[PDB]
Design a binder for these strands. Structure first.
Ligand SMILES: [Mg+2]
Ligand SMILES: [Mg+2]
Ligand SMILES: [Mg+2]
Ligand SMILES: [Mg+2]
Ligand SMILES: [Mg+2]
Ligand SMILES: [Mg+2]
Ligand SMILES: [Mg+2]
Ligand SMILES: [Mg+2]
Ligand SMILES: [Mg+2]
Ligand SMILES: [Mg+2]
Ligand SMILES: [Mg+2]
Ligand SMILES: [Mg+2]
Ligand SMILES: [Mg+2]
Ligand SMILES: [Mg+2]
Ligand SMILES: [Mg+2]
Ligand SMILES: [Mg+2]
Ligand SMILES: [Mg+2]
Ligand SMILES: [Mg+2]
Ligand SMILES: [Mg+2]
Ligand SMILES: [Mg+2]
Ligand SMILES: [Mg+2]
Ligand SMILES: [Mg+2]
Ligand SMILES: [Mg+2]
Ligand SMILES: [Mg+2]
Ligand SMILES: [Mg+2]
Ligand SMILES: [Mg+2]
Ligand SMILES: [Mg+2]
Ligand SMILES: [Mg+2]
Ligand SMILES: [Mg+2]
Ligand SMILES: [Mg+2]
Ligand SMILES: [Mg+2]
Ligand SMILES: [Mg+2]
Ligand SMILES: [Mg+2]
Ligand SMILES: [Mg+2]
Ligand SMILES: [Mg+2]
Ligand SMILES: [Mg+2]
Ligand SMILES: [Mg+2]
Ligand SMILES: [Mg+2]
Ligand SMILES: [Mg+2]
Ligand SMILES: [Mg+2]
Ligand SMILES: [Mg+2]
Ligand SMILES: [Mg+2]
Ligand SMILES: [Mg+2]
Ligand SMILES: [Mg+2]
Ligand SMILES: [Mg+2]
Ligand SMILES: [Mg+2]
Ligand SMILES: [Mg+2]
Ligand SMILES: [Mg+2]
Ligand SMILES: [Mg+2]
Lengths: 64, 144, 117, 201
RNA sequence: UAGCGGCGAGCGAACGGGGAGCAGCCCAGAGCCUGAAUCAGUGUGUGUGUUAGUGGAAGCGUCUGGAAAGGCGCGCGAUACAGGGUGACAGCCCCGUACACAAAAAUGCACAUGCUGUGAGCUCGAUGAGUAGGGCGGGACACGUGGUAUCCUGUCUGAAUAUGGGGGGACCAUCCUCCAAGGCUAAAUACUCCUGACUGACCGAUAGUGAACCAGUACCGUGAGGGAAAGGCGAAAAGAACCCCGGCGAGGGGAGUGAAAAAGAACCUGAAACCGUGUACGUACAAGCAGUGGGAGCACAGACUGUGUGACUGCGUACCUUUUGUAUAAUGGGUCAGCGACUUAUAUUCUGUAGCAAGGUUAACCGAAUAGGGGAGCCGAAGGGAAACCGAGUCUUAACU
RNA sequence: GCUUGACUGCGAGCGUGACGGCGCGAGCAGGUGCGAAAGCAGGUCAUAGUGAUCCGGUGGUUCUGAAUGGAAGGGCCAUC
């Protein structure tokens, strides 16, 4: 039967123009006041999935 | 051309791996699974995104955003699709009849993609700046 | 598509057994053993084609040594003399000559001695 | 494209695409193979160790008896046990793209014309429904193994054919690539050829 | 997909579209006109099945052979060359097949018709109360109580009643849509203990059913229950009269049958393990994976080389598995024969290959059926953004060098 | 002594990690502090002082809002 998607992965990843995946950075969720503003700013924008974990993401998201 | 003279193209059919048929085969005793582990086992292996136990990437990283229901009912049209309709008026109904947009599509946009040669009248559709310019150049008309 | 495998299996076994004719006991009667024996024989044969070359050279050298000494010269000295004299006769031939033609061998030895000194 | 007729010795114009294209062997082969696969029926089944009739109790205790460890009497490695990968009934029908099928037909038709195995005639009717008459007509036409393709459906012709195993009468709608390749010669009526051209385009 | 979900593992719609099939009615009720349509049972007539059946074409000569259906000649039938038998492979020898016919009787399904019950249409009405909601506890909806709509109810309550009420995914207003608390209803859908016909890139006696055979038997178990093994003489018994050895044996040798009995019922073929008889060569001073390289002699077969044996001699510690590493005194195998393990379906990606190409392809289904229709859909030709939205750009930011 | 640069948006380019990430960073825009000015300041001589995701809480919002207008809920930003 149809392959099922890993719904968590679906929530966390979105495919881009060539077939990458952007994702939201970790560590910008709670205790923030100790984190430096520069660090927070850098974490804020989205980020492409690296070469190492691309395969795993692909496995997770067969219909992405 | 008889039923015993036809033959496939070279490279069309390839040999099907048969595991575990002796030494010369190549895929001998073990069948390309190495020596006794979990992956070696029949039914063996670990589910998608399993990292030995490490919090897997699809969990490490935070969830984000929401899904728009209006996006499911929006659509994007091409100037080649402005020519693919019949007549000289591009409504939603006309586009749907043409089979360009989907049936449950309340909204559509004409984007500068491809090119429009014939004059067309885009009625009740959003049109991008490039597309509007292109249609006007073609000799078209846009109205709300 | 039930491919029954009697005929092929027996033919294969028979070929191995035939190859293992003349072996003591189950090594000529019982397939498992016969096959093991056949493989072993093959391995030995490969080894022994090499060893055959080695052995025959050894034999030739022994014979030549005996002959040369009978004509009053050691083998090593005789070979050196021949090399010096530019005689390219290989030692299979030298051994044969020694065994079957004493006059010829003696002549060769004389040549070697002269060349040596 | 132009096929001269046997009976009137008059030409008949046809499409170069349909009757004068190249022979794409790979495509034709795929289509014929597909036809064969479709024709097969595929009704069989063995019993898995699940389905083999017997109890599911352990033949002997795991340890102690010294025998090798057995779990079910229905094991595939046991005599009268299940077939390891027991078959089920399966559908061997391959899909063939419409265009691919049409192209194959076109190639076969072209090959026939080139090889002089397609014989076109104005009409191939028999007067009575009599095998003897059909046989005589075929002999007169020199033919023995033949696919008679007709435009309009003929009762006398079909009945006459029925008992000649080398002969087969078809309607132009029901031609098939394996049949065309198989039959030594193919005798098309003028209406039939025209219809085929219309069908194939 | 949207959603649900220790937001894990997993579960997973609906709206809308294409098809198959399409049938609508009745009571909460009385006045009128009233046997009025429909439905059910029951007789009768007709048609068409079903349960026995009838007819059903056309070939001989010759050779081989135990036997012709085979070879080689010359003919004939075919709306019949499906299939099965007959001394080897038969269109024409037999049974059938195509095709054309057949029912005293019983009965299925159609109409036609008679009888019985059944009640149509109009006007006026009436419009399902411990119910809908609610509180508490559970359950069902893709929906795990969550912001949770909707459905069911164990418990405690409890309306309005068309000037009315339900729903539109917390909730309110507006708008739209429908009328709960009473019923009936064919088709398209599911299945095969069983009956008939036909088919198979299904098996062919360790296979296929457990069971080709007197099998759910023998046997095992107190019992529920478990559960085998075991097919083949020959074309035809022509199954061996008679004689002989032997215990009025078993078994055998003649005889006879037969094409063949080394086809004799312990019966087609008749492998291997295993066990013998005969012949050649070797072997009783010689130490080990038993072979291999060299190699004398001896025997045989042909006119020296083939074959068989192998004195003596160099080298040489099986195989598998598992291991850093095994001759290992680590595992497994007494041997032989048969069987015994990377499959199948559906999704997805990449590679090859074929088709068409800014297009490609159809799914159910329909179909004088692998044709043709069917483009509902799906993938692609546009991306960016969480989204609104913008768009060859877009997002970020007040703005970007 | 005077102050709040213990700024906001970004950031060429590097370092270090299998990755999650972590680190250094001139310069640009806005707005400030000290200095006469050149200048310096995006915490502390540097290297420890820490905890992913989920699920919620609080505030803001030119996003969304299941007939429509709202609202709930969701998103985004800050934070617990
Ligand atoms: Mg936050
Ligand atoms: Mg290999
Ligand atoms: Mg290998
Ligand atoms: Mg492998
Ligand atoms: Mg192993
Ligand atoms: Mg290991
Ligand atoms: Mg491994
Ligand atoms: Mg398993
Ligand atoms: Mg469409
Ligand atoms: Mg039990
Ligand atoms: Mg079985
Ligand atoms: Mg089709
Ligand atoms: Mg009869
Ligand atoms: Mg007959
Ligand atoms: Mg004959
Ligand atoms: Mg015979
Ligand atoms: Mg009511
Ligand atoms: Mg209630
Ligand atoms: Mg409620
Ligand atoms: Mg309700
Ligand atoms: Mg609402
Ligand atoms: Mg057998
Ligand atoms: Mg059995
Ligand atoms: Mg049995
Ligand atoms: Mg007695
Ligand atoms: Mg007797
Ligand atoms: Mg026999
Ligand atoms: Mg026998
Ligand atoms: Mg034997
Ligand atoms: Mg001795
Ligand atoms: Mg000893
Ligand atoms: Mg010899
Ligand atoms: Mg030796
Ligand atoms: Mg190893
Ligand atoms: Mg060890
Ligand atoms: Mg060793
Ligand atoms: Mg051992
Ligand atoms: Mg082992
Ligand atoms: Mg053992
Ligand atoms: Mg694949
Ligand atoms: Mg491909
Ligand atoms: Mg100043
Ligand atoms: Mg410090
Ligand atoms: Mg979690
Ligand atoms: Mg939770
Ligand atoms: Mg909030
Ligand atoms: Mg709004
Ligand atoms: Mg709304
Ligand atoms: Mg809100």
């Amino acid at each position: 039967p149809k392959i099922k998607t890993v719904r968590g992965a679906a929530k966390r990843f979105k495919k881009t123009g060539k077939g990458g995946f952007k994702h939201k950075h970790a560590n910008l969720r709670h205790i923030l006041t100790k984190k430096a503003t520069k660090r927070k700013r850098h974490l804020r924008p989205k980020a492409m999935v690296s070469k190492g974990d691309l395969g795993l993401v692909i496995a997770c998201l067969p219909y992405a | 051309m008889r039923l015993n003279t036809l033959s496939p193209a070279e490279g069309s059919k390839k040999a099907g791996k048969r595991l575990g048929r002796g030494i010369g085969s190549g895929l001998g005793k073990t069948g390309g699974r190495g020596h006794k582990g979990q992956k070696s086992r029949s039914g063996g292996g670990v589910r998608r995104g399993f990292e030995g136990g490490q919090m897997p990437l699809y969990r490490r990283l935070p969830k984000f955003g929401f899904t728009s229901r209006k996006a499911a009912i929006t659509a994007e049209v091409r100037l080649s699709d402005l020519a693919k309709v019949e007549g000289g008026v591009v409504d939603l109904n006309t586009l749907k009849a043409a089979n360009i947009i989907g049936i449950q599509i309340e909204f559509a946009k004409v984007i500068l993609a491809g090119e429009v040669t014939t004059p067309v009248t885009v009625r009740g559709l959003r049109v991008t700046k490039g597309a509007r310019a292109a249609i006007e150049a073609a000799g078209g008309k846009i109205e709300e | 598509a039930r491919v029954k495998r009697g005929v092929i299996a027996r033919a294969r076994h028979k070929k191995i057994l035939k190859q293992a004719k003349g072996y003591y006991g189950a090594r000529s009667r019982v397939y498992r053993v016969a096959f093991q024996a056949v493989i072993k024989a093959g391995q030995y044969a490969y080894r022994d084609r090499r060893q055959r070359k080695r052995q025959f050279r050894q034999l030739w050298i022994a014979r030549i040594n005996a002959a040369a000494r009978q004509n009053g010269i050691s083998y090593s000295k005789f070979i050196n003399g021949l090399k010096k004299a530019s005689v390219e006769i290989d030692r299979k031939i030298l051994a044969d000559i020694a065994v079957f033609d004493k006059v010829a061998f003696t002549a060769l030895v004389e040549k070697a001695k002269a060349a040596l000194a | 494209m132009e096929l001269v007729l046997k009976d009137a010795q008059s030409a008949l114009t046809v499409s170069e695409t349909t009757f004068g294209r190249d022979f794409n062997e790979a495509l034709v082969h795929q289509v014929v193979v597909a036809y064969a696969a479709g024709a097969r029926q595929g009704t069989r089944a063995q019993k898995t160790r699940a389905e083999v009739t017997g109890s599911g109790k352990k033949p002997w205790r795991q340890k102690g008896t010294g025998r090798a460890r057995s779990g079910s009497i229905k094991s595939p490695i046991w005599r009268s046990g299940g077939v390891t990968f027991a078959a089920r009934p399966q559908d061997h029908s391959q899909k063939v793209n419409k265009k691919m099928y049409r192209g194959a037909l076109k190639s076969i038709l072209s090959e026939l014309v080139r090889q002089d195995r397609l014989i076109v005639v104005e009409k191939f009717s028999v007067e009575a429904p009599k095998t003897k008459l059909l046989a005589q007509k075929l002999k007169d036409m020199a033919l023995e193994d033949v696919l008679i393709i007709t435009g309009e459906l003929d009762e006398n012709l079909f009945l006459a054919a029925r008992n000649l195993h080398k002969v087969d009468v078809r309607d132009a709608t029901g031609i098939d690539p394996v049949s065309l390749i198989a039959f030594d010669k193919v005798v098309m009526t003028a209406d039939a050829v025209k219809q085929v051209e219309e069908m194939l385009a």
